[PDB]
Every structure is written in C-alpha cells, then in structure tokens.
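Our collaborator T.R. sent over the components below with a one-line note: 'Predict the complex.' Nothing else. No constraints on interfaces, no templates requested, no preferences about which chain binds where. So this is a plain run: every listed entity goes in together, and whatever single assembly comes back becomes the starting point for the next discussion.
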Amino acid sequence: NDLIYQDEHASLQPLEGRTVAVIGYGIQGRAFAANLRDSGVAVRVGNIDDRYFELARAEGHRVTNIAEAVAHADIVLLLIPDEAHGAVFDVDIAPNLRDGALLCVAHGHSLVQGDVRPLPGRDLAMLAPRMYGDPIRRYYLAGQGAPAYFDIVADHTGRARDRVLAIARAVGFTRAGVMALGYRQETFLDLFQEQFLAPALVDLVETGFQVLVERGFNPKAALLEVYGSGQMGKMMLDGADIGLDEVVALQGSPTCQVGYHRWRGRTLPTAVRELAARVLDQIEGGDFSAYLKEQASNDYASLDDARRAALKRPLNVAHAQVRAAFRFPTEAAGGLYQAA
Amino acid sequence: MASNDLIYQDEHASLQPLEGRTVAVIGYGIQGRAFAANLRDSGVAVRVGNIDDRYFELARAEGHRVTNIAEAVAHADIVLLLIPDEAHGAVFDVDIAPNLRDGALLCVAHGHSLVQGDVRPLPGRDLAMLAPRMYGDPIRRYYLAGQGAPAYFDIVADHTGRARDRVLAIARAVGFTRAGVMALGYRQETFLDLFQEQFLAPALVDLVETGFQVLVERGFNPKAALLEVYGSGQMGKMMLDGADIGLDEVVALQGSPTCQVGYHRWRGRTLPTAVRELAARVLDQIEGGDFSAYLKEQASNDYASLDDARRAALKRPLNVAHAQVRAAFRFPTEAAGGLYQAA
Ligand SMILES: NC(=O)c1ccc[n+]([C@@H]2O[C@H](COP(=O)([O-])OP(=O)(O)OC[C@H]3O[C@@H](n4cnc5c(N)ncnc54)[C@H](O)[C@@H]3O)[C@@H](O)[C@H]2O)c1
Ligand SMILES: NC(=O)c1ccc[n+]([C@@H]2O[C@H](COP(=O)([O-])OP(=O)(O)OC[C@H]3O[C@@H](n4cnc5c(N)ncnc54)[C@H](O)[C@@H]3O)[C@@H](O)[C@H]2O)c1
Ligand SMILES: CC(C)CC[C@@H](O)[C@@H](O)C(=O)O
Ligand SMILES: CC(C)CC[C@@H](O)[C@@H](O)C(=O)O
Ligand SMILES: [Mg+2]
Ligand SMILES: [Mg+2]
Ligand SMILES: [Mg+2]
Ligand SMILES: [Mg+2]
Ligand code: NA
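Returned assembly:
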C-alpha cells in the first residue's frame, strides 16, 4: 500500500545545526531556498556565474560557486537542469560532499542514466515536487503545500529518510503529502506528463481555436473560450480538488451538463492512446534520453528556435491581442522570494 | 479584423444608469447568486425572483428580498433571467412578459433561448444578452479582489435607446468591465459557448483520462498517475497561468530544460486529423438544431438521463482514483462559507 507523509509524519528536528546547500536558484532552487530560510533552516546557494547568482545575492542569500557551497553543507539539493547533473556531480559535488552528507535530486532522470550515483559513506535521495516554483512559494506563504514523491536510493547514515522528509516539511510538501515512489517510475511518469499530456492539452486547445476560426467565429472570442477567459484552467484546477466530472455537475448550467455528457468518453480516436503508448516507449527505452543529450548541444540552440517559432503561431498571435484587450486577474509577485 | 472588436472596460461604463432603479435577479443558481451578491455590494437595489425550491431559502438566508418570479418582475426596472435555458420559454410566457414594465430591460446570459425564439422582443421594452465567460464562484472571488471575468453582450431590442448603457451598468456592477465586455451577436455566442461545452471540455477530460488509463495499464502507481494527469493541480495551474501569459510561454518560463525539450518534441504533433473532424461534427450538431432537439428531449423529464450520466461518471476508474487521492493528499483550498453574504 502507499506510504504518504504529512506534517504529523515529519519534523525539522533533523535539520537542527545543519546547513543546506541549494545548488541552482532557478524555478525549483529559488522556491526551496526561500522556504528553507523562512522555516528557520540554515541555507547557502551554490551557483555558476550567471543571472541566477546575482538574483540569489539580491534576495539576501549567502552565494558562492557550487564546490564551495557543497564543502560547507550537510545536505545538498541539486536543483539544476538534468543534462548538467553528470559534469557538476563528477567535478563539483562528489569531490566535496562531506562524509555522512545527503545529496538530493528533484527528478530521477540523472539516477536512471547513472550520471548521479551513490557515494561510499554518503546518502542519496530523490525529493521530486509535483508543481513548479511560484505555486510552491505562494502555497508555502498561505500555510499550504504541493505534493512530492520521494525515494531513498542510498542510506549510509540510516538517517536519510527523516532528513529528506525534514527538507520536505521545511519547503511545505508534507502540508499536501509526500509519497514514496521509485526514482525510475518518477522519471518515466514525469517525462510522460511533459511529452504526451501537456502538449496534447495545448494541441487540443489550439485545434478548438483553429476549427472555430475556420468556421467564421471571432478570433478573440474563440481564444477566450478555448483557454484565454481562464474558464478551462479554472475547471482543471478546481477539478484537482473535487473531480473533473464533479466540477461540471456543480458549476455547469443544465445546458452545459447535457452537452458535456453527450460527448464525454467519446471524443478521441484510438490513435491518441496509441501515441501515448509510443511516447511512453520512447521514454522507457532511452530514445528520449538520447534526443535530450543531443538537444542540450550548443546550450539548447534547437529549443531556442522552437520557443521563438511557437510565439509566431496563430494561437499566440491571438493571445497577445486578447491579453492587450482583456485584463486578466493577477497578484503582485514583487518580493515573493524575499524573507517573510 | 481585430480593430473592429468593441470591448468595454470600467472607463467605458458607469453605475449612473442604475440610480433609483431595481434589478430583479430571476434565479439564484450558479450565475444568479453571483449577480445578486455583486449588485448588492456595488450599491444597486436588488430583488430575487425564484420558484419554491432550495434556492429560494438560500436567497433568504443570504439576506435578499425574495418572492416568486412574477412579483420580482412586477417591481423591477431591469430583469436578469438566470435560470436554465430550457425553462426560459414557459417562465417568459407566464411570469415575465405579462409583468415586464414599460421601458424595462430583460437580459439573458446565453443566446440559446433567443436563437430558439423562446425569449422574444416585446413592444415598448429592451432585450439584451450579457453572457459571462466564467462560472459563479470565480466571478464572486474576483469581484471581492477588485477583479472580474470577461463577458459578451448584444443589444437585441432597444425601445428606450438606453439599453446599451443599462446592460453595461449591470456589467460594471457585477465586475465584467474590470476584465472586458465585448460586443458579440447572441447567435454566435450560443454556438461558441455550446462548442466549448460539447467539444473542448469533454475532449480535455477525455485526454486527462486517456493519460490516466495508459499509465495504470503500463503498471504505474494509480495515485501518482492521477496526480500527474490533473490531481496535483499542475495541469490546471499551467492552463490558468497560460490564460494570463500564453500556454507555450508558461512552459518556456516554468519548465525545466528537460520538460521544454520533451514538450517541444510533441507540441503540434499529438493529434490525428480525426479530432479536427469530430470538432466540425459537434459544430454541425450545434448550428443545425440537432443539439437543441437533444437538449429539449433531455429536459422534458426533469433531466432524468443527465442524473443517470452524472451518477455513472462517478463510477469511472478516474473518479474512483480521484476519491482515493483526495482522501490521502491535502489540496490547497480557500474557506467558502459566507462568500455571497454582504461585503
Ligand atoms: N521546473 C519545475 O517545475 C520542476 C519541478 C520538479 C522538478 N524539477 C527538477 O528540478 C531541477 C531544477 O530544474 P528547474 O526547472 O529549476 O531548472 P532551471 O532551468 O530553472 O535551472 C536554472 C538553474 O540551473 C543553473 N544551471 C543551468 N545550467 C547549469 C550548468 N550547466 N551547470 C550548473 N548550473 C547550471 C542556473 O544557474 C540556475 O541556478 C531539475 O532536476 C528538474 O527536473 C523541476
Ligand atoms: N453556469 C455558468 O457558469 C453559466 C455561465 C454563463 C451563462 N450561464 C447561463 O446562465 C443562466 C443560468 O444558468 P445557471 O448555470 O446559473 O443555472 P442553475 O442550474 O444554477 O440554475 C438554478 C436556478 O434556476 C432556477 N430554476 C430551475 N429550473 C427552473 C424552472 N423550471 N423555472 C424557474 N426557475 C427554475 C432555480 O430555482 C435556481 O434559482 C442560463 O441561461 C445559463 O446558460 C451559465
Ligand atoms: C463550468 C463550465 C464548464 C461551464 C460553461 C459555462 O461558462 C456556462 O456557459 C454554462 O452553460 O454552464
Ligand atoms: C510546468 C510543468 C508542465 C512542468 C513539469 C514540472 O513539474 C517539472 O517536472 C519540469 O521538469 O519542469
Ligand atoms: Mg514534473
Ligand atoms: Mg453555457
Ligand atoms: Mg459559457
Ligand atoms: Mg520534469
Ligand atoms: Na476579432
């Protein structure tokens, strides 16, 4: 059965007198560093010479190169892009990781690939959040959290489990739940969400926009209905709480509910489930891993080209027009990662 | 052309047309409760007209002046018909049309009853659509935070010549002008709204469910599979942040390079031609009257078939997994008690 840790199952006692080195200050690193500090945990940032180094300094952290951070740390969180783990592990982390220290990754991919490996005398774990940084930080400040998966890969000390779960409690994940899941399963599951589900959801939204525009509908209205009004996202986020079919039962007019249930369970041909299986096969059999290693070349040049090209697509041209014309509800984000 | 769109914000609307006027909110459901609460908090005189059911009692519990529909209409300058569309015809014929004052304005929140001829222009009166693009709880939460949701409007009949400023005064009072209120014909609004409900919403959920089913079949932990396809809130957060800054932009901003490379490997390539073809079939059913005939049949027995479909959907593996996940993982929520009581 499942092992799910909440606040009752974790404590900050294991972090008493210990220093955490957050390696990276990106989407995850900034959120971990901010929440650890506000939870009363001694934290240091290790970072290469880029904008994230300057940002960590601007937000009041003790910031050094990665080797120096690791050498002054009891716990090391490797929160940099996965393709970078191998070289940083070999050169900066492994030579400086104290005897009895804990190294944590936030995704299983570098463990599956053998780029991050158990070290004699040291602990190794995965603590993999199921949400990006801004919500982890916003939830933390509101007394809430996002879920995470964890795995104890190597435990020399016999104290790795409570130290990993203490980090999880300090960053807020035990407010939701931290479930035991093998790092190989986390890797394949996580990549599947990114490679099948996220693109399929955006492709469906784009398909709806294209068909409406083809059939003579107002492009601003078409863009608002398929996602830009926030209704489809609100349905999906409220659905996380109460269930997706339940949101329609509770919030839908009878007209809406009758229409929804006419086509619910009937919209997709078998080619969709077949492509999901093909994506999982690419993930499980190393084809994506090889593709990722290639794309990391000249600092992700091909990704830069794909990012720029996507902004020129009709959906994103229409998004810029709608967003300039309709005010979307936002909250001020200035100072979000400064000390609370 | 994009330049042709007529979009009103707060600077283009005022509460002045509502000075000394009473709005009758007919119905106190998903839309009715939000309209009533926001109108009252905006300083607009509001009454609720409702049949004898749980919504009558809720309106009283929430401090409103509540009567049957005919009495509400008889004492109002503006009437908002916020009940299910299939009920518009009988309520219009029996309770509204005979009681609507000279020079009063009737608004619907969906064009379907206008397309079908169940709600019609009345000599000496005004008729309009103000169609919110969001359900009630967000309209209310946004309103209380000084925000709003978009809406479409159409002036169908304007005896007084004052219908536009009165419709937009309602829109400002309920908060839609804080986002934007765009002119769109009631017929277009009808088909567009139905398309969102019959193609896009069920396809998004079917896609989430297909992901869940494939993961469970391939031996993944069902709780984890459920969390990743939506239960974590990540896919919802992606789509809601995407509404702000763009869907491809959320991935560029918030995704690890591993995530962005994976996403861009399959973006624009996941769906076969048959999905597009199905979207066109659903539009054909909506535009040609097939869906209107289906809906009339479904309603004719107080939605008995919908009750069966709602109960059957809760038994699907995705929804069984949802209850297991929800029990075991705490989801961030905000207290909702008293949300619709006076500010
Ligand atoms: N983004 C998310 O929502 C998310 C969620 C869960 C897990 N993760 C995991 O968290 C880890 C960090 O991902 P992220 O999304 O925060 O990444 P990111 O793209 O925000 O990472 C930027 C950070 O990485 C550093 N960096 C980049 N290239 C480097 C290199 N070659 N050597 C050293 N430092 C380098 C930068 O200086 C900066 O500190 C990854 O293992 C990722 O899979 C990400
Ligand atoms: N739900 C939404 O998010 C939403 C959004 C925009 C537009 N609309 C439109 O708003 C209107 C109201 O829809 P809703 O979703 O609030 O409905 P709902 O299902 O919440 O409506 C319940 C209300 O309708 C009343 N009602 C039901 N059957 C009735 C009958 N036969 N006679 C009289 N009153 C009756 C009930 O007493 C109650 O006040 C519709 O035109 C709908 O298309 C709904
Ligand atoms: C809850 C969401 C799917 C509803 C679509 C709504 O905007 C409304 O048009 C309705 O008829 O319910
Ligand atoms: C924003 C969302 C689609 C990203 C998936 C994230 O949880 C993370 O796994 C990543 O690698 O970026
Ligand atoms: Mg992830
Ligand atoms: Mg509707
Ligand atoms: Mg709608
Ligand atoms: Mg990931
Ligand atoms: Na337009």
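Summary for T.R.: Strands of chain B lie at 7-8, 22-26, 45-49, 66-67, 78-81, 105-108, 126-132, 151-158, 181-183.
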